[PDB]
Design a protein around this ligand. Structure first.
Ligand SMILES: C[C@H](C[C@@H](C[C@H](C[C@@H](C[C@@H](CCN1CCCC1=O)N1CCCC1=O)N1CCCC1=O)N1CCCC1=O)N1CCCC1=O)N1CCCC1=O
Ligand SMILES: O=C1NCCc2cccc(c2)OC/C=C\COc2cccc(c2)-c2nc1c(O)c(=O)[nH]2
Ligand SMILES: [Mn+2]
Ligand SMILES: [Mn+2]
Length: 181
């Protein structure tokens, strides 16, 4: 298969630490970034979005669950649950908001904004965990219209998503990413 050249953009566009974290996360599940480059980009973007989400809070407002070893990412959730008495989610979340004591599941969708929620709410029947979806076009959708974060932080988020979209369109690989889900 040799190289991919889209992974080159993925490496030149994202934080080196984010790239390494996404690479190790994909390799954990028997997937190759060198071939699944659209994946690679999707997991890198999800990682970055979760990171700006955690940064847009206060100081201890968010416990980051995504970007960890599966065993440790579960250990921290078990600790959170035995701490706050919150029922453990059936599926591993993304963040945990201490301020409002809820597991936030960050969704970075590619198709319609409604479809990602229609899938995520159906996946985790645990109605306690919160669900928040961002869009590449610049839209969003949260659970019970409770968007948790501010508005300028979320706006900076969607700005970053549209910047990544424009960068992908510059090198003419945008439809290849939109048609890979
Ligand atoms: C805690 C540590 C890493 C954190 C990830 C992340 C790093 C942070 C880097 C800072 C600088 N900023 C802020 C501005 C841009 C930047 O570059 N950001 C945030 C944006 C992207 C990024 O890189 N954040 C966010 C909260 C505090 C922190 O450090 N992670 C990784 C997963 C778990 C976790 O908490 N790690 C690395 C693994 C072991 C560990 O404990
Ligand atoms: O928590 C998560 N965990 C998934 C961890 C992972 C990383 C790499 C490879 C994997 C598993 O195995 C491959 C089979 C399918 C997965 O591929 C995609 C592709 C695009 C987005 C996501 C997953 C996505 N993952 C999560 C989210 O929370 C989320 O919003 N989106
Ligand atoms: Mn996740
Ligand atoms: Mn998620």
């Amino acid at each position: 298969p040799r190289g991919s050249h889209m992974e080159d953009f993925v490496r030149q566009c994202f934080n080196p630490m984010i790239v390494e974290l996404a690479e190790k996360a994909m390799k954990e599940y028997g997937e190759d970034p060198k071939i699944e480059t659209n994946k690679f980009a999707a997991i890198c973007t999800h990682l970055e979005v979760c990171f700006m989400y955690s940064d847009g809070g206060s100081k201890h407002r968010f416990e980051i669950i995504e970007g960890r070893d599966r065993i440790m990412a579960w250990t921290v959730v078990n600790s959170i649950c035995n701490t706050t008495g919150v029922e453990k989610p059936k599926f591993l979340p993304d963040l945990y908001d201490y301020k409002e004591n809820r597991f936030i599941e960050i969704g970075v969708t590619r198709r319609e904004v409604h479809i990602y929620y229609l899938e995520k709410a159906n996946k985790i029947k645990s109605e306690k965990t919160h669900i928040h979806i961002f869009s590449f076009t610049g839209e969003e959708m949260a659970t019970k219209a409770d968007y948790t974060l501010d508005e300028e932080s979320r706006a900076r988020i969607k700005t970053r998503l549209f910047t990544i979209r424009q960068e992908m369109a510059s090198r003419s690989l945008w439809d290849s990413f939109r048609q890979s889900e």
